[PDB]
Design a protein around this ligand. Structure first.
Ligand code: PRO
Ligand code: PRO
Ligand code: PRO
Ligand SMILES: [K+]
Ligand SMILES: [K+]
Ligand SMILES: [K+]
Ligand SMILES: [Mn+2]
Ligand SMILES: [Mn+2]
Ligand SMILES: [Mn+2]
Ligand code: NA
Ligand code: NA
Ligand code: NA
Ligand code: NA
Lengths: 512, 521, 508
């Protein structure tokens, strides 16, 4: 029994490949898929974040749909306090990125406690701001003022993560009938599929939240409800000069987002399949189509793509996930997502560490299960119009890593660019990317297979010696992490001279 | 639009059919010619002044056919080759190494001399009786009634109704009666018989020695004359290779043994021959007589296939531009034969009569050169590369990894060349194996390694005459710039183009473990 | 134990493993799918010779109208039919034979020994057309001086001699030289020649072909779509069922091939003149591209010229000629052609037999699984029902190692679709249309069988009768025997405009 699903790897067809998947074929130790965790009251303590980091967390997400600047700043500080609790040991230190997830053009309800909305029983949507806090089973207020100009006779309104549904019967108010009932809570989200919502891509709140992200030196923004390239560019404008290096990950979570997908991709730095609202804005049975289309097209462009939301939902209450949840994580990884995400499971659930641990474990099994040879061939075909020198290095290196079954790839990188181009070509072996730039190290977490290492050492006067310094750091990192041992082979990627604008030098080195 | 060079639009096809359908006559080929060109030297090409023009036309390997000629003759030819080759040595940047190969007589069956009385040749007529004798009194008195041949033990291997073939299988006899010391035959295929013509017995187990006393002396003489390779005739099994090896011995251990496949038995036992050999020749002339002629292409394609799979050199040989012995231009089939052989994957292609005795030896050499570049571009590299990888994928060898990584990287940035620093040749050899479309400029201080490199598709050997620089860094750099200068002068690339450079990181390495993309300065 | 028909290689995953598995000890099947077209001249024109020509494998008789009179070719055509019809007593083993008129077209030619670097006077004066000399040569091109430049080259006699234009009458310097003779072909590569595409000498020959009941025209030096439409206009209403095979033999033919292919009913790679018009080292490029594009559109393609050239004087071919034939079949050519080999050679019978033997070796050595998959993909925009039925039948033939496909057809179009998808098993095509059966020899695999019985009362009875005739033909010619499996394509009801019914039927 070969490890790392290598028998399946040798197969000629996809059918064969699958018939060959073996439960007794141990994954390797390295974990290539990044894990993004929404932080909240279950996970907001220094103490729990230490454990979250140890469990697998690479990126911490701040959900700006709730909480004040004060509250979010403290959390950020808590994440950093915990991340830095490991700073003294360069061999084990894990950078941890901070992510800002914006509110965007949300429609939420008001205050009431709880109220029940029965199947068939009429309900009245109003915008009269006197009822902001006087909602019940007769009267329902939401904060979207122009709701009336955008919906038709026979339109549907979904309330509370799509659980409750309503049909608009007559016309600054709407009178609806309950189609799908439930219990109605305070400040629950509202969706209007088929309606072309005209709230700003970026509201005042958003603008203040984005500016705040700048001040807080966040590494990336998760931009909610992006519909078009112009939305992305608005977000880019607010971040401005001081924040030019923060990556904009666009959230695809409505029909228009999907329609205009190519342009959003081009304009953005990465993408998030935000399946929550997506499954409400379009039929839920269609979501997998979008997941797969998006991940595919992001792989093709070499830009990070994140599969999110409800991936291990039941784990909010139970210590073990469901069979559907297991399969969902694996398939997201087989689809080619760079990152997978936890929301409620870590923000508020009863088993936050467990959820992180489960993602870590499923990631490795599915990583080994990919059909690397065909995937490599297909990505090469897709990028074949480009003759880029760094792509050439990356492909040669990856192909080199497949042939000799290298234990890792070692990339020296300042901008991160060399590392990213290696990642996009999907080697099985982890990419240990050594960098003197802390932000690059943090942002590298967006890319499948990059294990970032911060090098704190001063630069040596001799280039070769400074280079050897950084490779040996990765050698030491790779060994403490159980990636390799003395006598294994790794691919190494460096600049020949200090002026080399990319890793133009590849080597097969034995691990010392 | 822009029409891409080197059939690069056809290179991007997803199917073999679309690749065919994208082939473009207006897609100009590159200047590098990757297919090694082997020329049989003879009266047509022996002079020093003609050999120089053979080199300028593209000859990489001069072949000495030991079925004819004394040692005094071949030593003069080999001298002439080296005189011609060294006339160019004054320009290290332009000088082209030239390999010397010894093609052995082997277990050949030949007829005698036609008698003086009568016509120059005889007419063997369909339905007429011809007797075959071993009586040495007729060895120079052959005619229509009585034919002498040199296989003394012929009577022990043929039967009544056996077929004896004569003169490149143009003339066939059927054995009608068997005598102890003679055969009575009937002519099935008529024709005009000259002297010392080739005889084949396809349905017979010929007991002649794989390596005869003549071959032995011929081999030893090969060793004393510092030939780079041996083309061993009529190799039937592995033990035939081991015998040639034994004879070449310790002194000739770096001499490459190319096994010539030309009988059914050599095709049946090909694998054990390949393992034992340094390379193979599809020696089609005899093969097309021993097995049915309509079956030769199957064997040719199987062999070229299996040597590609194994990383061993293969040569397509025989009658490729045959008509150019008397005509300035080839036929349309001949043009196709050269191209399809290159497409098959042949590392080298060869010329026999076309350079040995022909009227147009320079024009023959030039034509192979021009076809080879057309077909080299017309190959389906992306699919060739994928399929060679799959067949070798049980190997995790480090040099193959470097080789695969370098070729892949050359496909992606469309490198103008791969530079390879090598002493034994192994590093270059393994790159060649994986079939980049760019040329492989191999730099070596080992002169023999340079000459042997012609056996491998794409390797453009370059002799480094400079002393070993003290710092390993400067010694590597020196050998890169040489390849840079060679490349530029030869028109393979210019400033601003990109090459893939393969080097050793430290002196100790036993293979190129360093790959770079580097701009030409 | 070795599987027949290269079936071990048929099972390879990659192109390389397919090559590596090719087995000389793997026996080919009896049937031969690549059509043999044979140029008929003084060596082959007699009835007795022609009978053996048909016996050895000739399917198409080609008359070359570059030479000879209407009276001469009429005698040749007359002898072809006599030979052919001498077999008509046995409708089982009778082999239909097709007659092709190959047009002179826009030739240039000399009148009635040249040293390298010697000056030669080219003139158009009709006072020299019978006394051509060392220093004065006459040709029949009038516009020549308007289409050639200083420095441009002119080639004489199958491109053997080269002469560079030095001054405008034309004075030239010989480059390559040899023995010069009577009425020798002239080529002007890369100079746009403006001779009529279909001359008066052509329009007379084409009309002759209609009257002479020929099945296909091979239209020489086809440059563009217009040119095919001209040959099509000339053939007129009476000659509408005659197929037009356009001959690709100059740079523009290749340049504009696509519009030509759409306009033509088939294509010949006319290699001789092509290897004179473009660098000869490029010919294989144009050959493979062309065959591929024809394969794709499912229009017949003939590979032609010099395939067995040395057999003009020798009983056995060179290895380069062997190789050429097999690679032509592996390329995908529907038909292969002999010229000088059968027209004037010393061994026209042996040349036919070697094309036959070479064909069957190479036909088995095709990589059918990959070829089918690649044809389907390229034709995937088409949803045509006959194509659907064809593809399903070929697929079914592959899966059960079926001994043959039996196709019933009047237009031939159903059989043409089957052939196009390249089964390894032969296609027995039964037709009451004598001209359909003759034109079928243009398509890979199609073994046309003439039905001479009248249309039966019951539609089902008429189908069984035709299918049983196809079984009888197959069994007599050793394609299959009792218990073998065949794919059988028929129409369900009389009015079906194609074979909509497919069966796996046992051979009785
Ligand atoms: O460094 C890590 O742990 C993760 C692995 C994939 C992206 N970054
Ligand atoms: O260097 C040369 O000229 C030839 C080309 C490939 C093999 N050697
Ligand atoms: O019937 C025959 O013999 C040939 C086979 C291919 C075309 N016609
Ligand atoms: K949000
Ligand atoms: K020999
Ligand atoms: K003609
Ligand atoms: Mn959302
Ligand atoms: Mn031989
Ligand atoms: Mn022609
Ligand atoms: Na970089
Ligand atoms: Na004599
Ligand atoms: Na070496
Ligand atoms: Na039909």
């Amino acid at each position: 029994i070969q490890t790392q699903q290598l028998h399946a790897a040798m197969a000629d067809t996809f059918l064969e490949h699958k018939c060959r998947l073996d439960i007794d074929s141990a994954p390797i130790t390295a974990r290539n898929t990044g894990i993004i965790c929404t932080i909240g009251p279950a996970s907001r303590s220094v103490e729990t974040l230490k454990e979250m980091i140890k469990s697998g967390m690479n990126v911490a997400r701040m959900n700006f749909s709730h909480g004040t600047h004060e509250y979010h700043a403290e959390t950020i500080k808590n994440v950093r306090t915990a991340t830095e609790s490991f700073a003294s040991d360069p061999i084990l230190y894990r950078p941890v990125a901070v992510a800002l997830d914006t509110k965007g053009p949300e429609i939420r309800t008001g205050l009431i406690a709880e109220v029940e909305l029965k199947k068939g029983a009429t309900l009245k949507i109003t915008l009269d701001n006197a009822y902001m806090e006087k909602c019940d089973e007769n009267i329902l207020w939401l904060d979207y003022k122009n709701i009336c100009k955008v919906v038709d006779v026979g339109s549907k309104v979904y309330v509370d993560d799509g659980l409750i549904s309503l049909q608009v019967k007559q016309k600054d108010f709407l009178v609806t009938e309950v189609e799908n009932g439930g219990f109605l809570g305070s400040k629950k989200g509202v969706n209007l599929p088929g309606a072309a919502v005209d709230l700003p891509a970026v509201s005042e709140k958003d603008i203040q939240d984005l500016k705040f992200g700048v001040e807080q030196d966040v590494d990336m923004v998760f931009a909610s409800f992006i519909r078009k390239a112009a939305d992305v560019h608005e977000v880019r404008k607010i971040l401005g000069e001081k924040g030019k290096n923060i990556k904009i990950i666009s959230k695809i979570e409505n029909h228009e987002g999907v329609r205009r997908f190519d342009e959003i991709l081009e304009a953005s730095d990465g993408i998030m399949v935000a399946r929550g609202d997506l499954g409400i804005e379009i039929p839920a049975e269609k979501v997998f189509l979008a997941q797969k289309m998006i991940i595919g097209r992001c792989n093709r462009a070499g830009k990070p793509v994140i599969c999110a939301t409800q991936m291990l939902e039941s784990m909010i209450k139970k210590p073990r996930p469901t069979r559907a949840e297991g399969s969902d994580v694996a398939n997201a990884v087989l689809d080619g997502a760079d990152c997978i995400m936890l929301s409620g499971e870590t923000a508020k659930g009863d088993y936050p560490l467990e959820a992180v641990r489960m993602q870590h474990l499923i990631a490795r099994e599915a990583e080994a299960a990919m059909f690397h040879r065909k995937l490599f061939e297909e990505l090469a075909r897709a990028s074949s119009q480009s003759t880029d020198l760094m792509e050439a290095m990356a492909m040669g290196s990856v192909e080199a890593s497949y042939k000799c079954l290298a234990a890792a790839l070692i990339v020296l990188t300042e901008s991160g660019r060399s590392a990213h181009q290696v990642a996009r070509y999907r080697p099985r072996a982890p990419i240990i990317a050594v960098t003197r730039n802390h932000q690059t190290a943090r942002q590298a977490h967006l890319y499948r297979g990059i294990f970032p290492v911060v090098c704190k050492d001063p630069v040596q006067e001799a280039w070769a010696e400074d280079v050897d310094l950084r490779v040996n750091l990765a050698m030491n990192v790779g060994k403490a992490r159980g990636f390799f041992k003395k006598g294994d082979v790794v691919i190494v990627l460096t600049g020949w001279r200090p002026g080399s604008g990319f890793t133009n030098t590849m080597r097969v080195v034995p691990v010392p």
